[PDB]
């Protein structure tokens, strides 16, 4: 049986699994006030990808395909292709194409295009409103509010590179985006299918441990907090090793290699999330070279030391 | 520890010189230019070289604070570390880790957050890595934006790369130059602590490149980007730290659906791949194929002529 293990990459060296930005800090807090059901960064300890999770860290929240539009309009509808430019298959047992954003908000980026015949290129500012009734990636259609009305050509490879999020400064500050509100993947009236399950701390006195980044802001006063359940490198690691889980909870220990001492211990649940023994909101101040270390398989009733 | 390579397919991996996915394998002659990239450099036992770091998304990104001349639109960014700590130019590196390693015009977005109230702003920005004021080693990078007053001073500012451009009036695909290193300390300066140049020395062998297409934002730019190692291989070698028992490692690219060995290649200890072929050619691979480490062989090992 292949022994289980977690990567030794520090938090700063790892990528957020819900947006192509690096991880900044570890965070813990109560999660009863909302539903923790992200579709990206979902992977079991034995390597089963869940939800909309794929393996490329840079292709989260990116779209590929061809664009059309009503003549004279700045809104462009993109017919989604695969990441390798192949035909999108809307019949796969997934909530949406792999890497589709799993939160409701306004993502601002750049829409780029290349004309195949002569290699001419163009790029424009573009924003996708994942909460809009027109957002339907599962059906293969996504709309981009751009700053041009005639520059993008039809039947040419077009790509959206995400940059950050925006917010209407005239409304309540930090009211957008909502990182714990899943988009409507096939339209405002349809129902999401094949979703990865929701996640909540079950042991009394335990809270989820989030891997937190700060999304770049492009306009207004956006809520730039983004918490993922697993680093993208851990999703890549478990998918490759596919080591069988000997129990339902893998006990991890955070170690400072400058001293060897254990700073805290946490539960890595088989379904793919982390809990710690703590009550209340708190950012974790870790050494720059700290890392997680698998130590032993325990059960679900194990009692962690009250840290983290 | 025994040596091994990741089992990720080519399309599941990231280019190590730009935050974009890999698209195909490519081989060709490399005697007409100097192959000396600084990103995506890592020995098989996990020693990072040049400006290579571990984050696939922190490649070609910049962080710091911006100032500018009143009325002008080129902003000067005083660089900070990737984690907003102060920049230390005394480190034995050619430039901050993740600095672009090619001469060209990278276009992206400059975003900024005012700390006191959380107000944000973003503008189109282009960095000219061939310009005289491109001195990341000294901690200074110039950005040409589309606003002349909107960026505030003493506030955290980040550049997110998107693609490349070129002057549409000049010859097509003359820019960028992916095999021309920028001057990391300014126009007149000389680079330091560079990763060594790479050339296939075995007779009949050529470099195997992991190729991506950089997005184009204006003009007719040369969008080919070749890296010597996928970023996931860099992350893997750094963690495994498996010692090298020879100077070349024999890898086999295999289709897990049929067991067919599709080609053979050498993974050199310094961190690059060679194949037995003459001429330029793209490699058409099945979507599930991946590299598998076989054994440490000697340097006079002759690969099967393929790929």
């Amino acid at each position: 049986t292949k022994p289980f293990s977690v990567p030794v990459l520090t938090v700063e060296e790892m990528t957020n699994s819900r947006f192509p930005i690096p991880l900044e800090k570890l965070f813990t807090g109560p999660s009863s006030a909302f539903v923790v059901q992200p579709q990206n960064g979902r992977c079991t300890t034995d390597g089963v990808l869940l939800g909309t999770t794929q393996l490329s860290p840079v292709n989260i929240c990116t779209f590929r395909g061809d664009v059309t539009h009503i003549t004279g309009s700045r809104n462009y509808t993109m017919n989604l292709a695969s990441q390798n430019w192949n035909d999108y298959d809307p019949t796969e047992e997934i909530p949406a194409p792999l890497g589709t954003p799993d939160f409701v908000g306004k993502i601002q980026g750049v829409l780029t295009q290349t004309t195949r015949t002569d290699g001419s290129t163009r790029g424009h500012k573009a924003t996708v409103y994942t909460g809009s009734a027109d957002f339907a990636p599962k059906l293969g259609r996504v709309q981009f509010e751009t700053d041009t009305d005639r520059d993008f050509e039809a039947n040419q490879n077009t790509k959206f590179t995400p940059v950050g999020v925006i917010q209407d400064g005239g409304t309540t500050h930090r009211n957008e985006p909502q990182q714990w509100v899943l988009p409507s993947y096939s339209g405002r009236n349809t129902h999401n299918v094949h979703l990865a399950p929701a996640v909540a701390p079950t042991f009394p006195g335990e809270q989820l441990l989030f891997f937190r980044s700060t999304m770049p802001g492009c306009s207004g006063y956006p809520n730039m907090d983004l918490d993922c359940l697993l680093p993208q490198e851990w999703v890549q690691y478990f998918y490759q090793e596919a080591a069988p889980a000997q129990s339902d909870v893998a006990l991890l220990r955070f170690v400072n290699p400058d001293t060897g001492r254990v700073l805290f211990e946490c539960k890595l649940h088989k379904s793919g999330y982390v809990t710690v023994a703590h009550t209340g909101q708190h950012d974790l101040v870790i050494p720059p070279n700290g890392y997680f270390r698998f130590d032993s398989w325990v059960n679900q009733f194990y009692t962690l030391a009250p840290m983290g | 520890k025994p040596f091994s390579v990741p089992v990720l397919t080519v399309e599941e991996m990231t280019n190590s010189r730009f935050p974009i996915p890999l698209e195909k394998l490519f081989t060709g002659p490399s005697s007409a230019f100097v192959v000396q990239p600084q990103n995506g450099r890592c020995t098989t036992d996990g020693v990072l070289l040049g400006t290579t770091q571990l984050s696939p998304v922190n490649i070609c990104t910049f962080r710091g604070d911006v100032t500018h001349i009143t009325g002008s639109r080129n902003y000067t960014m005083n660089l900070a570390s990737q984690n907003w700590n102060d920049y230390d130019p005394t480190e034995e590196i050619p430039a901050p880790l993740g600095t672009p390693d090619f001469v060209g015009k990278i276009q992206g977005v400059l975003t900024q957050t005012t700390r006191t109230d959380g107000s944000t702003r973003g503008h189109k920005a282009t960095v000219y890595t061939g310009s005289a004021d491109f001195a990341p080693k000294l901690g200074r990078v110039q950005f040409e934006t589309d606003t002349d007053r909107d960026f505030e001073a003493n506030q955290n500012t980040k550049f997110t790369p998107v693609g490349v451009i070129q002057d549409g009036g000049t010859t097509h695909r003359n820019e960028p130059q992916q095999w021309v290193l920028p001057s990391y300390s300014g126009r007149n300066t000389h680079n330091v602590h560079l990763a060594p140049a790479v050339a296939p020395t075995f007779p009949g062998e050529q470099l195997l490149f992991f190729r991506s297409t950089m997005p184009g934002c204006s003009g007719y730019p040369n969008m080919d980007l070749d890296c010597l190692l996928p970023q996931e291989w860099v992350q893997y070698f750094y963690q495994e730290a498996a010692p090298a028992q020879s100077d070349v490692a024999l890898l086999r690219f295999v289709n897990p659906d049929t067991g067919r060995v599709l080609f053979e290649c050498k993974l050199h200890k310094s961190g690059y791949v060679t194949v037995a072929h003459t001429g330029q050619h793209d490699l058409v691979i099945p979507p599930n194929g991946y590299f598998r480490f076989d054994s440490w062989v000697n340097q006079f090992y002759t690969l099967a002529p393929m790929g």
Partner: nanobody
Amino acid sequence: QVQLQESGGGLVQPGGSLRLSCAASGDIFSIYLMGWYRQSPGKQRELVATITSSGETKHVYSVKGRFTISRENAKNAWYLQMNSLKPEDTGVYYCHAVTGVIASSWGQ
């Protein structure tokens, strides 16, 4: 190692339909990408559609919704259902197969 022959061309009226076939033989177990190409007059050989052994398809923008690629599970033959044919579809059609990273075989 692999040799192919196409069959199904000819004259048809605009808006009509043709079904092109391509027969393979000899170690078709090695084939992992099956495609169709066409050679319009005055232009270079361009791709029409591809399909992998797993069934992953790609069509070009000019034929989206009109053309359809399909293959037998034994990879002894793959087809191209052309519907609603326009004057721009005129040209010689070659069926294509990929046997190795460099190796490939064309039709007559």
